[PDB]
């Protein structure tokens with residue numbers, strides 16, 4: 001017999017990403033900064049490294065879309081689903097999609113793109129949802145109002161259980 005084995009984690013530490021398109025809500029620089037910071041959350045505590053590609057295929061393809069946007073997991077307009085991401089693997093694996101019917105911001109207004117992206121990239125790297133309400137990988141979005149972000153211990157233990165520490 002055969003089962004469907006899951007790729008639990010990337011077999012390589014050096015990963016690429018590409019920002020395929022951009023939300024209207026934030027400047028290009030703001031979007032790039034948010035994603036850069038979101039990846040840094042994970043690379044700061046693991047041997048993982050992330051390199052941005054401007055063209056072609058990257059491991060983590062990032063895009064904004066609304067409604068049905070090419071994977072038959074359609075978005076739902078304002079609120080509800082905010083974004084989703086695929087677990088590690090080839091093709092769609094690792095990819096992250098953000099609902100552009102949300103208002104994305106670099107602040108408390110709407111949904112903070114950095115916060116949501118950091119969470120989604122957790123999925124791209126092989127993390128499922130945490131039961132700890134204080135974790136980044138908790139299923140519900142909140143905003144602390146703080147200027148600095150520190151990755152909760154639960155998320156650190158989770159990602160390090162896959163990739164080891166930095």
Ligand SMILES: Cc1ccc(CSc2nc3c(c(=O)[nH]2)CCC3)cc1
Pocket residue numbers: 073084085086087092123
């Ligand atoms: C080929 C293939 C297609 C789809 C998937 C699942 S995509 C997906 N991932 C995740 C969530 C989701 O809603 N959708 C929640 C967090 C993880 C996995 C593999």
Ligand SMILES: Cc1ccc(CSc2nc3c(c(=O)[nH]2)CCC3)cc1
Pocket residue numbers: 082115116119120134135136137138139140141142143144145150151152
């Ligand atoms: C979909 C989804 C679900 C949950 C999140 C995480 S919200 C969030 N987490 C955390 C902090 C925060 O401010 N906000 C501080 C550190 C943990 C982000 C997106």
Ligand SMILES: [Ca+2]
Pocket residue numbers: 058059060061089090091092093094095
């Ligand atoms: Ca991919």
Ligand SMILES: [Ca+2]
Pocket residue numbers: 075076077078079080081082099101102
């Ligand atoms: Ca939505």
Ligand SMILES: [Zn+2]
Pocket residue numbers: 069071073084097
């Ligand atoms: Zn999608």
Ligand SMILES: [Zn+2]
Pocket residue numbers: 119120123129137139
């Ligand atoms: Zn999630």
Ligand SMILES: [Zn+2]
Pocket residue numbers: 147148
């Ligand atoms: Zn500060």
